[PDB]
Amino acid sequence: MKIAIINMGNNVINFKTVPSSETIYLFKVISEMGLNVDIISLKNGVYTKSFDEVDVNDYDRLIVVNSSINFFGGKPNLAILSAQKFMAKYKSKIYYLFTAIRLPFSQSWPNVKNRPWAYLYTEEELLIKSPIKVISQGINLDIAKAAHKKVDNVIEFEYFPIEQYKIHMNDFQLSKPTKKTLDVIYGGSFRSGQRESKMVEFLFDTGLNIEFFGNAREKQFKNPKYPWTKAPVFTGKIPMNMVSEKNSQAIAALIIGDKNYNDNFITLRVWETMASDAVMLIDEEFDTKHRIINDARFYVNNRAELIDRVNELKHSDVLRKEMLSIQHDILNKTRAKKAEWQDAFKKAIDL
Ligand SMILES: O=c1ccn([C@@H]2O[C@H](COP(=O)(O)OP(=O)(O)O[C@H]3O[C@H](CO)[C@@H](O)[C@H](O)[C@H]3O)[C@@H](O)[C@H]2O)c(=O)[nH]1
Ligand SMILES: [Cl-]
Ligand SMILES: [Cl-]
């Protein structure tokens, strides 16, 4: 048996981008699960084979990492077009890994037919008719189904904690004690709405030494609904395989909520922070029942709480190390259920 995993709208090569990284990590955990898998992308590479050098129907399972189908600038996007062409030729059920709420499966043909370059493609080439199974990272299938209310062939939905792929890797390692150069740190991208609101709340005008790494930029926070005066330091996007090491430079790293993610999704960030040398502080709204760690000290409601909690950590090395000890213990407990996680995944993809 052979499995093919692809990203539906982003080229895959290495850890330079988040979409590529997530695809490679899934490829790795699936492979270490004792399954034969190939990542199929635009060209052959260390981790990939090209769409044109293989036959999609030589694979028994087709797994697709979610992506946007929108064509930036109205121009063609070969990753999207090539991926869907690949998917359309497949004659068995397609397993869609739904890791981000804003990226539900959708047909690209409707977008293509109205473009000047539509004549270069056909409905037959791009229209994916095979049945699709949405594997939601969020436990709430109502939200998952609501996101796919416009797709016809999406037959089934099933929850699976996809984001644990980093902790289950064969070469996973907790971060070790690190020299502290920051009070708080957050590595990610900007997103309008609640996420933007909370980034301002917890990262702006705190009076703390805070760094915001990733491709996010200060110019993106201009919503007058969320005013601020002093912003954290933005330092640039780094490879995804160095996130925990980066988080470790700070005393604490934040988990910030967002609409439809709260009390539904556990995000990769959770494990990257928990595994780092930085104390994990969680936006209360994101996990109201303290499902991640049953210790109120790891949660903060607002800017006031965050500042107080961070100052408490800065002045008590014992509190800091105790909390790290606690989050690391909880993480190991999750890693202990590796076999269960693997069997659950296999079940998700009908194995
Ligand atoms: O310089 C940086 C900063 C961030 N990251 C990575 O980017 C990820 C995503 O960050 P962000 O873009 O802020 O999105 P999140 O809302 O934190 O998480 C989204 O992306 C995760 C990874 O796919 C999913 O688990 C979540 O469900 C999805 O909402 C992080 O976890 C890091 O692994 C980097 O690789 N380099
Ligand atoms: Cl999203
Ligand atoms: Cl990492």
Curated annotation (Swiss-Prot):
Enzyme Commission number(s) of this protein:
2.4.1.27
Keywords associated with the record: Glycosyltransferase, Host-virus interaction, Inhibition of host innate immune response by virus, Restriction-modification system evasion by virus, Transferase, Viral immunoevasion
InterPro entries under this entry? Answer: Phage_Bgt (IPR015281)
Name its species: Enterobacteria phage T4
Instruction: Report the SUPFAM superfamilies cross-referenced here.
Output: UDP-Glycosyltransferase/glycogen phosphorylase (SSF53756)
Which domain of life does the protein's organism represent? Viruses
Reaction equation(s) it catalyzes = Transfers a beta-D-glucosyl residue from UDP-alpha-D-glucose to a hydroxymethylcytosine residue in DNA
Q: Which GO terms describe its molecular function?
A: DNA beta-glucosyltransferase activity
* Summary of subunit composition and partner proteins: Monomer.
Q: Name one GO biological process term.
A: symbiont-mediated suppression of host innate immune response
- What's the name of its gene? bgt
Name of this protein? DNA beta-glucosyltransferase
Q: In which pathway does it act?
A: Genetic information processing; DNA modification
The task this protein performs is described as:
Catalyzes the transfer of glucose from uridine diphosphoglucose to 5-hydroxymethyl cytosine of T4 DNA to yield glucosyl 5-hydroxymethyl cytosine (glc-HMC). This DNA process seems to occur immediately after DNA synthesis since the DNA alpha-glucosyltransferase interacts with the clamp protein gp45. The glc-HMC modification protects the phage genome against its own nucleases and the host restriction endonuclease system. The glc-HMC modification also protects against the host CRISPR-Cas9 defense system.
